[PDB]
Ligand binder design. Structure first.
Ligand SMILES: Cc1cn([C@H]2C[C@H](O)[C@@H](CO)O2)c(=O)[nH]c1=O
Ligand SMILES: [Mn+2]
Length: 346
């Protein structure tokens, strides 16, 4: 038991917050960055003052999560990819304490070259030996879900642009603190990655080890959108209007929970107008543990509060290295090796 059972609430903790303006001009405090990402931290950084288009893109794409999740089964079955371990396209998963959640995954190779559906395959790295990273994206039909693909790409591009600036700040820290560190490494790794993976998640309405570490470098996050799908039906019926976002969460216990090295778990909120970034294990390895991936988990809304009508939508963008990039620069372990569980090499 990490969080109190029943109606009792965990304390809420404030994440370190910086302005995108300071990320862009290179004046973000490295003290604040270490407070956000260091060994005693929550492993999360909130970025405010985001581009003006963010609010609408978030609203549209999180609405698409509901529309997508309610497409006829014949359409969703075409988006399933078992060879990719369901890490490309659509699939159904479950969360127990008892919520059903549909996931849609896409690689973000398009960030580097908009014509790419996935990394260019090689003998060393291809869909047959790394299907969970290198399989081609599977998109819903434009006629049945109009505008989904450009909206998805535009919001992911915005979030990755910000991730590149966060990575640049991390590089400033590492260049000051780590002897022999390659200047500009994390910025280059994020900016050129064709393995970065985005996940659009839809919690279906329901009637009345817990933590993980992210594996990549920096995970961009939106705040969650709750939708009353009885009031605004998630049915594609001119442009496609967004669905109604509930102003306030129906369940104050839903959300993100982080267990710092203090051993106790706190709830952490993302302001609706902000983007947050969590550190992952690859960034921890690249910084030799000077920044840490911090254990955490997400809870959906309890069925009593969903009341068979309220769905929950989120976007996460797992920026991470190309498979051949080193993550342990002493032992020369690559991200692909690291992903296959290799922890030592000689
Ligand atoms: C699918 C995926 C998940 N993650 C995060 C969320 C998962 O719960 C965790 C372990 O895979 O890492 C990544 O960092 N990269 C990915 O490609
Ligand atoms: Mn996570």
């Amino acid at each position: 038991g990490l969080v109190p059972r029943g109606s009792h609430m965990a304390p809420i903790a404030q994440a370190v917050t910086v302005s995108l303006n300071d990320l862009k001009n290179g004046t973000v405090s490295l003290e604040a960055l270490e407070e956000a990402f260091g060994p005693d931290s929550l492993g999360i950084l909130v970025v405010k003052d985001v581009p003006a288009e963010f609010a609408e893109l978030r609203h549209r794409l999180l609405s698409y999560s509901s529309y997508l999740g309610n497409l006829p089964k014949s359409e969703l079955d075409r988006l399933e990819n078992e060879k990719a371990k369901y890490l490309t396209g659509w699939s159904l998963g479950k969360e127990t304490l008892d919520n059903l959640k549909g996931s849609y995954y896409a690689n973000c190779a398009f960030y580097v070259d908009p014509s790419l559906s996935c990394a260019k395959p090689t003998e060393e790295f291809n869909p047959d030996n790394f299907p969970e990273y290198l399989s081609p994206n599977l998109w819903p039909q434009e006629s049945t879900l109009p505008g989904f693909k450009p909206t998805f790409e535009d919001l992911c591009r915005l979030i990755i642009d910000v991730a590149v600036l966060v990575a640049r700040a991390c590089d400033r820290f590492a260049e000051k603190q780590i002897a022999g560190y390659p200047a500009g490494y994390l910025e280059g790794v994020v900016k050129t990655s064709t393995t970065t993976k985005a996940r659009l998640l839809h919690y279906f309405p329901e009637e009345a080890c817990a933590t993980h570490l992210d594996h990549g470098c920096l995970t961009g996050l939106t705040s969650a959108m709750f939708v009353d799908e009885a009031a605004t039906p998630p049915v594609v019926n001119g442009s496609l209007p967004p669905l109604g976002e509930l102003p306030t969460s129906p369940d104050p216990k839903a959300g993100l929970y982080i267990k710092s090295r203090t051993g106790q778990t706190v709830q952490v909120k993302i302001p609706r107008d902000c983007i947050a970034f969590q550190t992952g294990e690859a960034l921890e390895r690249i910084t030799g543990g000077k920044f840490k991936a911090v254990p955490h988990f997400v809870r959906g809304a309890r069925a009593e509060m969903s009341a068979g009508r309220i769905a929950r939508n989120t976007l996460a963008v797992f920026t991470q290295p190309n498979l051949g990039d080193e993550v342990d620069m002493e032992q020369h372990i690559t991200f692909g090796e690291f992903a296959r569980g290799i922890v030592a090499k000689n």
